[PDB]
UniProtKB/Swiss-Prot annotation:
Alphabetic keyword roster: Dioxygenase, Iron, Metal-binding, Oxidoreductase, Thioether bond
Family (UniProt): Belongs to the cysteine dioxygenase family.
Post-translational modification (record): The thioether cross-link between Cys-89 and Tyr-153 plays a structural role through stabilizing the Fe(2+) ion, and prevents the production of highly damaging free hydroxyl radicals by holding the oxygen radical via hydroxyl hydrogen.
Protein name as catalogued: Cysteine dioxygenase type 1
Biological function: Catalyzes the oxidation of cysteine to cysteine sulfinic acid with addition of molecular dioxygen.
Keyword Kinase on entry: no
Induction: By increase of sulfur amino acid intake.
């Protein structure tokens, strides 16, 4: 019985219920993430920005079933084109807007990766991606507004691939956490 999360802490408790088992009801997880109304005071602790690139701030480790993290995107900050390491990946906007560009998996032949579509993710929306859907890039294209997003990955993963848009070639990257549980982790 999915109820509206009243707070971030309530959302986290609900997520622990939704991930108690071995499978993932994607539509229910997405619905509960979308139903949480972002309250900046509840997540200010995790919203630690860096001047030069986006930061990943771990919020909850989901008792091993998922990583819940907050990403903080300065103006003009964006990601690589990347995969999600055979995990579910939910992305909910907490503040601002992000541009999501979707790409197909490259072929063996070296070729330019041409976007398949793009969309603007707005405040409180929750999007979803997995490797079966494709690859994506996420970018804060704003010149004036930092963006903050809440990401849930299940199972948790510490590495993924970045893809060269000019060729489709991929390189393994290790995810680093800027902070964990509100504590800066150099
Ligand atoms: Fe992603």
């Amino acid at each position: 019985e999915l109820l509206k999360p009243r707070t971030l802490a309530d959302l986290i408790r609900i997520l622990h219920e939704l991930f108690a088992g071995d499978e993932v009801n994607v539509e229910e997880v997405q619905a509960v993430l979308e139903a949480y109304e972002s309250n900046p005071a509840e997540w200010a602790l995790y919203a630690k920005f860096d001047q030069y690139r986006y930061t990943r701030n771990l919020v909850d480790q989901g008792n091993g079933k998922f990583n819940l993290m907050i990403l903080c995107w300065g103006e003009g900050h964006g990601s690589s084109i990347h995969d999600h390491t055979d995990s579910h990946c939910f992305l909910k906007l907490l503040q601002g807007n992000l541009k999501e560009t979707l790409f197909d998996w490259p072929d063996k032949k070296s070729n330019e990766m041409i976007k398949k579509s793009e969309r603007t993710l707005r405040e409180n929306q929750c999007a979803y991606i997995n490797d079966s859907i494709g690859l994506h890039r996420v970018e804060n294209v704003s010149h004036t507004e930092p963006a903050v997003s809440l990401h849930l990955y299940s199972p948790p993963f510490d590495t993924c691939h970045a893809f060269d848009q000019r060729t489709g070639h991929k390189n393994k990257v290790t995810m680093t956490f800027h902070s964990k549980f509100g504590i800066r982790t150099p």
